[PDB]
Structures are given as structure tokens and as C-alpha cells.
Swiss-Prot record:
<feature type="domain" description="Bromo 2">
    <location>
        <begin position="4"/>
        <end position="109"/>
    </location>
</feature>
<comment type="subunit">
    <text>Interacts with IRS1 and IRS2. Interacts (via bromo domain) with acetylated lysine residues on histone H1.4, histone H3 and H4 (in vitro).</text>
</comment>
<feature type="modified residue" description="Phosphoserine">
    <location>
        <position position="93"/>
    </location>
</feature>
<protein>
    <recommendedName>
        <fullName>PH-interacting protein</fullName>
    </recommendedName>
</protein>
<feature type="modified residue" description="Phosphoserine">
    <location>
        <position position="3"/>
    </location>
</feature>
<feature type="modified residue" description="Phosphothreonine">
    <location>
        <position position="47"/>
    </location>
</feature>
<comment type="function">
    <text>Probable regulator of the insulin and insulin-like growth factor signaling pathways. Stimulates cell proliferation through regulation of cyclin transcription and has an anti-apoptotic activity through AKT1 phosphorylation and activation. Plays a role in the regulation of cell morphology and cytoskeletal organization.</text>
</comment>
């Protein structure tokens, strides 16, 4: 049950996504870039990602671990850095702040999960 629960990350990620949706800094990243509206986005970005898509992937059970979820979130930020590379851009600054917030909060989720894995493997 509760110590080393290998499923506890799911609720922890739901809670973190809730915080992220509350942040004004997430506003550009909540929904997919409108590919019909914004022409050259696909010329630049191979794999779009956004927080609504991550939140639905989680709700759907399609992440095997919090590291898979983290990979998709990191793609949100790497896509922004590629599309909006200037340190002068306020959008760049938003992405930087929100990335730092995410990386701060996800740290403990991943470490806790990996510790759970190691314990269960050791005692299996
Ligand atoms: C999510 C993201 O990279 N948005 C940047 C953007 C802005 Cl600010 C304005 C028009 C189109 C785009 Cl794609």
C-alpha cells in the first residue's frame, strides 16, 4: 500500500498539471498551436505538444511512468525554444519561468518513483 506505491505518481502529476494550468505563464502552452491558423509552425517544429494533450494522455492511461510524462512536457519547452529562440521575447521568458517551475516540482515525483522501483525490484 502507501510507502513505495508505484502508482502514486499519477495523482501527483494530475496535481502538478493543475498548478501549471493556473499559472499565467502557461497560457501560450495550454492548447495545441493552431496549425490551420499559424502557417510556418510545422515548417519548424517536428512534434507539437501542449499541456492539454499531456493532461489527456495521462487521464487516458497512456504514460507508463512519470519519466514518459516528463519527456512530453520537456518537448513543450524545447519546441518553444526552437520557435521562439530570442532571450528578448517575452514568450521566451514565459517558457523559461514555467520550465523552471515544472523542473522544480517534477524532481521529487521522479526520485520517489525511481526509489519505489528499486525497492520492489530488490525484494521481488
Ligand atoms: C506555443 C507557441 O510557441 N506560440 C508562439 C506563437 C505566438 Cl506567441 C503567436 C502566434 C503563433 C505562435 Cl505559434
Amino acid at each position: 500500500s502507501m510507502s513505495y506505491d508505484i502508482q502514486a505518481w499519477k495523482k501527483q502529476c494530475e496535481e502538478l498539471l493543475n498548478l501549471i494550468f493556473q499559472c499565467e505563464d502557461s497560457e501560450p502552452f495550454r492548447q495545441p498551436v493552431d496549425l490551420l491558423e499559424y502557417p510556418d509552425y510545422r515548417d519548424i517544429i517536428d512534434t507539437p505538444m501542449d499541456f492539454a494533450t499531456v493532461r489527456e494522455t495521462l487521464e487516458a492511461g497512456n504514460y507508463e511512468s512519470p519519466m514518459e510524462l516528463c519527456k512530453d512536457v520537456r518537448l513543450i519547452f524545447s519546441n518553444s525554444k526552437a520557435y521562439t529562440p530570442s532571450k528578448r521575447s517575452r514568450i521566451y521568458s514565459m517558457s523559461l519561468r514555467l520550465s523552471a517551475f515544472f523542473e522544480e516540482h517534477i524532481s521529487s515525483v521522479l526520485s520517489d518513483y525511481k526509489s519505489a522501483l528499486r525497492f520492489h525490484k530488490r525484494n521481488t
